[PDB]
């Protein structure tokens, strides 16, 4: 842990979604419109409702005072770059 | 680190005075291209 | 005690859902274009102790 | 004294609703190295209900995939709005607009 | 997109000014900004182009540190489903709680005001930015040659409720106003309607010229 | 009609006609390989997900579709990689649990150093 | 005035000679924007469009305003135009007092030069 | 649409060709009001183009306007500026949950599901029902188990969904949220206002004074003057947005802020200029023209090197100073902050909210979502104070029998 | 909205239902702007990506009811992978 870079990856900065990014996940979702038993991965829930309960009470659509988080944190600032150069 | 400079042009107002005139005389021609490609290049 | 809620609801539910609905505001206010029972109560004037205490000072007068 | 205060009764955390309505696939558990332990601090150092569930999830779906059903389409909203889903989204609208009074 | 992405935002600089984090008069005064600088409660400055105007970003003070405090979304929980804290008591000063070190919290998880203020015209060369870059930057990881191993030093662990500060610097050249005032919604309606019925007309008249 | 469409479309086209017109320069000057091309094959083979290889098989013996049943074959493929992914970033893995969860998403664990070398 | 003060600063009569090369470079460039602005096609439209606007206006104005005030003595189409060159339906006593004025207006500005300059 | 043939067009070889064609007549016209329109934008761009040569900046504070008070830097100081609205950081959590109550009304982001939801309890005629779910049953009561309380909560939500149904009613109709249908993003903003200036939609509820044009008394008198006294405040809050975002645009090019607002708690006003950072003067501002205004990274580095690093030529030896500039030498000269070090001096206001979320660990659960704040008035007090004096109140109900 | 572009359009908003009227006038337009702006709707456009990422089902459905294998799996998986990371926490998109 004492290599580690503290920068953590243009990668693993998850979406968070603004105010007008949740209202349109939730308008195209809302209008988004041989086998038998145990052939199933198991999980054969249903699609379209655990999609609404994620876009209203999911983690990537939680806070509600993010702008643009992907972009703004997927840049290197003037301190996260001293920071790499010493190392 | 290797670090990198430019050839920094040491004039400065010899360096910078075309490219100011086409800075401020291209936005015209921006302007009267596209007009004239919709309102000729279309209903010749 | 026995304020409005146990009174509507009352046996309607069990002391769990009591607490439940109980944490979700007072009754319905100016949120809800309704006139609060807060400030109403500033919309009423005094009652005849006003009348005849003021008429008692009246008199003193 | 019904005023703000909040409370454990809205399920307010949807891991809980998905593990215990729609998330019934069961892990093969293994030991763990970071868990909570005492002074409370995360450091280093039912099942047969939900199987019941898990079975006639697989039930429906398979009927509801070889196209036995009263509309039809492996895939749509049958609105039977599950009233759980409508039922947090009002408690949120309703704590949030009534956090006028907390002055 | 790694292109179109960027270029867009270059033609479309003033729909990325915030409007999130900012409400009514949500200005702060320097001395204000000064005092949450110098006790590490901003967690990203991003200074404008012409380095006479800031934006400061502050996290609301629960969604700072890791505490499980009943107020922050339960982000991250436990198999019995108790939000996570990560309080560490200070052997040196206990009895305060304010005074125990916490870890902080991923930036892309806190909820935000984003305050205006606005710089004074010597504000880079009285040295206060740099004063603070210095003192946050000169600590770091340490060999213990006593007990023969690599240690994190207590004055180089954020307390509860600190952040580390991010200084971003915003290009005056990445804006782009000629092109995001010649592209403008207005500006596009008219050039729709005028190509249809010129291609309209085009057609009608060719239509009508070989009916002759 | 729609600008606002038409844009995208066009730097895409644009972008992607220069990556075909440089595929092509490169071909030509730099001929293809005979066998490495199945060095690429396998290599693209291989990070196709379990939930296809179903089909993969069923592509191999025959019985793959007309062109239409394979068409509708492998979206509820697609739709249950989904649909487990979204398990994956929910609930969690096959071999983790909450606790695991909430270590990953807190990045609290480092990259294993003395197992790279 | 601090534009002044540095031109007077830092370069036998020659702060008077830099002042009127100042004065003199600002008024020929905002002239030559001018023209070169009006020298465009599409502006010259512009410029006839307002202009039978404005004139139509103010036939209006002075018709409606003219009648009231006879009273009070009393008392006490655009396409013809619009499709059509500009100066055959303008005269040419117009241009001329447009000249008649300037001219009266500038014709003084030998001697102001002369006496200014020379004491 | 032979516009061209009355009286009056006659003697010109062209319009008499085009009283012969209708198509050439029609694309004349839209030739004629295309040119209009490229006209229009070559004088508007001129128009926004040229002022920016002619503005010119205070040199002393740089455009600023504003210098700083050095007094403050390291019953306070007199000179500088009157501290602003949000310097107070015990109100922080109060104004945000004010401003996010405001904001909850407006909000259309749940649009759809509020609207179908209106659209089932507004007529309940459709029931187009397909097939019920396989129901699950709940373990009974007397199995004191976290999963076991979740499924009985999770049992009970039809009857209490009703409860607050009949206590609070669809928001659309208590006015609570905006409209059913006022606006929806694709018809025209020009429709989309005239619907919102309809009836004071522009408003929340609070505010609006149709709510209380009905009861004005002689009771209090602030009925219909204590809600114009908080509109008031609401506008001028907007108004001050609407400033704060030009200034911002204007600053994220290089442009001088058109806003010049007073000083702060900080710094002063700049004397050479009044305060007003910059203006317009006739005289073109050779520096903007031939493009030097920004001042070459490596000159200022060389300036703020020569600045923080002062010389001192003389040395005590022949000079009878041997002590450092300043005042009280003699004076100047007379615990673990080696280790952990400070104590940061911001935070205290919150030292006891963290000793009660240590004394109570399961309020770390995440079926509980408190409101939030800091004083005994909000937050995790309220929760606690509400737990205790409900757990007294009804076990000494079970006192009654 | 024929008055969109130009300036002439402010004589408009004049027109519609301790300091002077003109100033209130003013506040009363800033405010129906600022309430107009805060309903967040003004992304919603019928030619994004993210509507027609989730649309593609629908118009797949009502038209056919009117090495090419890798290809076909790893756009469906792109497209997938797209509505992963527009819909909550993917990691790399
Ligand atoms: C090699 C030999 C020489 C070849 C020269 C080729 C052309 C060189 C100059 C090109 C760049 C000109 C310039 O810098 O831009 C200055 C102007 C901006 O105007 C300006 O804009 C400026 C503000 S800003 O830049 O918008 O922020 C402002 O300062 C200024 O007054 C105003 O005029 O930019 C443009 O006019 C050109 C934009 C590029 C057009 C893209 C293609 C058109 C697609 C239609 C959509
Ligand atoms: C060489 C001089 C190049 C000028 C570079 C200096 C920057 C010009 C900014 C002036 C701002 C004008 C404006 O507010 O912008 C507005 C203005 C629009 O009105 O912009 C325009 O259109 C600009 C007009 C075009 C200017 C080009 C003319 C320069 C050359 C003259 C002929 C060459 C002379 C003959 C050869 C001589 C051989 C001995
Ligand atoms: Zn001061
Ligand atoms: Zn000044």
């Keep these: 842990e004492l290599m580690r870079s503290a920068v953590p990856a243009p990668g693993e900065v998850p979406n968070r979604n603004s105010r007008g990014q949740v209202a349109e996940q939730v308008r195209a979702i809302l ?45 290197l600032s003037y301190t996260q770059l001293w920071a790499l150069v010493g190392e | 680190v290797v670090v990198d400079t430019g050839v920094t042009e040491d004039d400065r107002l010899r360096a910078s005075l075309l490219v100011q005139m086409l800075r401020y005389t291209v936005p015209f021609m921006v302007i009267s291209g596209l007009f004239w490609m919709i309102h000729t290049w279309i209903l010749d | 005690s026995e304020d409005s809620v146990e009174q509507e609801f009352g046996g309607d539910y069990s002391e769990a859902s009591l607490e439940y609905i109980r944490a979700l505001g007072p009754k319905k206010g100016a949120p809800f274009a309704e006139v609060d029972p807060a400030e109403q109560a500033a919309a009423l004037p005094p009652s005849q102790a006003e009348c005849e205490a003021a008429k008692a000072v009246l008199e003193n007068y | 004294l019904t005023s703000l205060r909040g409370s454990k009764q809205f399920l307010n955390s949807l891991t809980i609703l998905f593990k215990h309505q729609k998330m019934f696939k069961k892990k093969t558990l293994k030991a763990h190295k970071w868990h909570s332990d005492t002074q409370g601090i995360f450091r280093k150092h039912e099942e047969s209900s939900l199987s019941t569930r898990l079975h006639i999830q697989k039930k429906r779906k398979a009927k509801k995939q070889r196209l036995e059903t009263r509309r039809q389409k492996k895939r749509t909203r049958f609105f039977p709005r599950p009233v759980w889903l409508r039922s947090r989204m009002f408690l949120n609208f309703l704590t949030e607009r009534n956090k006028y009074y907390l002055n | 997109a790694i292109f179109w992405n960027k270029l867009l935002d270059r033609v479309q600089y003033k729909e990325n000014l915030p409007q999130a984090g900012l409400v009514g008069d949500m200005r702060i005064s320097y001395a204000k900004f000064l005092e949450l600088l110098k006790d590490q409660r901003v967690k990203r400055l991003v200074v404008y182009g012409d380095m006479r105007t800031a934006v400061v970003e502050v996290p609301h003070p629960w969604s700072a540190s890791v505490l499980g405090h009943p107020a922050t979304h339960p982000f991250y929980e436990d198999s019995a489903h108790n939000r996570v804290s990560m309080l560490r008591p200070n052997p040196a000063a206990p009895e305060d709680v304010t005074q125990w070190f916490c870890a902080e919290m991923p930036e892309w998880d806190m909820e935000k005001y984003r305050f205006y203020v606005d710089l004074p015209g010597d504000f880079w060369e009285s040295g206060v930015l740099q004063r603070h870059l210095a003192a946050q930057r000169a600590e770091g990881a340490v060999w213990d040659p006593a007990s023969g191993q690599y240690i994190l030093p207590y004055r180089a662990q954020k307390k509860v409720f600190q952040v580390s500060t991010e200084v971003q610097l915003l290009d005056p050249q990445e804006s782009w106003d000629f092109l995001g005032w010649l592209l403008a919604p207005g500006r596009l309606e008219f050039y729709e309607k005028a190509a249809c019925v010129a291609i309209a007309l085009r057609v009608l008249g060719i239509v009508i010229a070989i009916s002759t | 009609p729609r600008l606002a469409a038409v844009m995208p479309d066009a730097v895409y086209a644009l972008v992607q006609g220069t990556h075909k017109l440089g595929e ?77 969860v909430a270590v990953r998403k807190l990045r609290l664990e480092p990259p294993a150093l003395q197992a790279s070398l | 005035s601090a534009i002044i003060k540095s031109i007077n600063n830092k370069t036998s009569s020659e702060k008077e000679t830099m002042q009127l090369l100042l004065m003199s470079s600002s008024i020929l460039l905002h002239l030559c924007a001018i023209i070169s602005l009006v020298s465009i096609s599409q502006v010259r439209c512009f410029v006839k469009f307002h202009l039978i606007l404005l004139y139509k206006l103010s036939n209006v104005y002075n018709a409606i305003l003219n009648q ?20 055959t339906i303008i005269p040419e006593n117009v241009d001329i007092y447009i000249w008649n004025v300037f001219s009266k207006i500038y014709r003084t500005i030998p001697l102001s030069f002369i006496s200014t300059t020379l004491g | 649409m032979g516009q061209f043939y ?39 761009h001129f128009a926004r183009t040229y002022p920016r040569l002619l503005q010119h900046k205070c040199q002393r504070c740089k455009g600023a306007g504003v210098m700083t008070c050095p007094a403050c830097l390291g019953g306070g100081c007199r000179v500088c500026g009157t501290a602003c609205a949000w310097d107070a950081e015990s109100e922080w959590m109060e104004r945000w949950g004010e401003w996010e109550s405001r904001l909850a ?40 188990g976290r999963w076991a309380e979740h499924d009985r909560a999770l049992h009970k939500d039809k009857k209490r969904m009703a409860a607050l149904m009949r206590r609070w009613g669809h928001p659309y109709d208590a006015d609570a949220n905006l409209g059913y249908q006022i606006v929806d993003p694709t018809a025209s903003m020009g429709e989309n206002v005239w619907n919102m200036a309809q009836v004071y939609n522009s408003l929340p509820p609070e505010l609006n004074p149709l709510r209380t044009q009905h009861l004005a008394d002689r009771g209090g008198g602030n009925t219909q003057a204590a809600v114009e006294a908080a509109r008031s ?10 400033a704060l975002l030009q200034n911002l645009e204007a600053a994220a090019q290089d442009l001088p802020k058109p806003h010049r607002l007073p000083p702060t708690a900080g710094t002063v006003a700049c004397n050479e200029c009044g305060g007003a950072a910059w203006g317009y003067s006739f005289f073109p501002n050779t520096a903007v023209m ?29 000079t009878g100073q041997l002590l450092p500039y300043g005042e009280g030498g003699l004076r100047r000269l007379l615990a673990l902050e080696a280790v952990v070090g400070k104590a940061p001096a911001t935070t205290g206001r919150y030292r006891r909210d963290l000793e009660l979320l240590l004394a109570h660990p399961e309020l770390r659960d995440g079926a509980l979502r408190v409101p939030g704040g800091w004083g005994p008035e909000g937050g995790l007090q309220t929760y606690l104070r509400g737990q205790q004096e409900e757990q007294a109140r009804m076990q000494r109900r079970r006192d009654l029998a | 909205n024929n008055t969109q572009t130009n300036a002439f359009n402010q004589n408009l908003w004049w027109l519609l239902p301790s300091i002077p009227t003109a100033s209130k006038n003013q506040i009363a337009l800033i405010r129906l702007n600022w309430a107009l702006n805060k309903t967040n709707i003004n992304t919603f456009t019928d030619y994004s990506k993210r509507n027609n990422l989730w649309t593609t089902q629908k118009l797949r459905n009502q038209s056919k009811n009117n090495n090419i294998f890798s290809k076909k799996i790893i756009s469906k998986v792109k497209q997938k992978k797209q509505k992963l990371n527009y819909m909550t926490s993917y990691l790399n998109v």
């Design chain 8, 6 to 44: 009355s009286r009056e067009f006659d003697g010109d070889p062209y319009v008499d060709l085009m009283r012969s064609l209708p198509e050439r007549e029609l694309v004349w016209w839209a030739q004629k009001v295309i040119w209009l329109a490229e006209g229009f934008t070559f004088v508007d």
């Design chain 8, 233 to 242: 405040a609401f506008d001028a809050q907007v108004v001050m947005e609407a």
């Design chain 8, 105 to 144: 009304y407006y909000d259309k982001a749940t649009g759809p599901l509020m609207d179908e939801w209106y659209e089932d309890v507004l007529n309940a005629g459709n029931l187009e029902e397909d097939t019920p779910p396989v129901e699950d049953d709940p373990p009974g009561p007397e199995v004191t």
């Design chain 8, 290 to 318: 031939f493009g030097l205004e920004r001042p070459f990274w490596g000159d200022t580095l060389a300036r703020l090197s020569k600045y923080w690093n002062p010389t001192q030529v003389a040395d005590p030896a022949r």
């Design chain 6, 24 to 100: 092509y320069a490169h071909d030509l000057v730099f001929p293809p390989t005979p066998e490495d091309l199945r060095k690429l094959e396998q290599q693209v083979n291989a990070t196709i997900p379990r939930e296809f290889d179903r089909v993969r098989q069923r592509y191999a013996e025959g019985k793959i579709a007309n062109d239409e049943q394979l068409s509708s074959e492998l979206e509820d493929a697609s739709f249950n990689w989904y649909r487990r992914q979204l398990r994956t970033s929910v609930v969690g893995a096959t071999d983790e649990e909450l606790e695991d």
């Design chain 7, 68 to 87: 009231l005030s006879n009273k009070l003595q009393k008392n006490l189409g655009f396409l013809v135009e619009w499709s059509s060159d500009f100066i």
């Design chain 1, 31 to 75: 209008d988004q419109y041989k086998a038998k038993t145990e052939d199933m991965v198991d999980d054969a829930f249903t699609t379209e409702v655990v999609e609404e309960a994620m876009a209203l009470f999911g983690d990537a659509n939680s806070v509600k005072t993010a702008w643009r988080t992907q972009e703004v944190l997927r840049e």
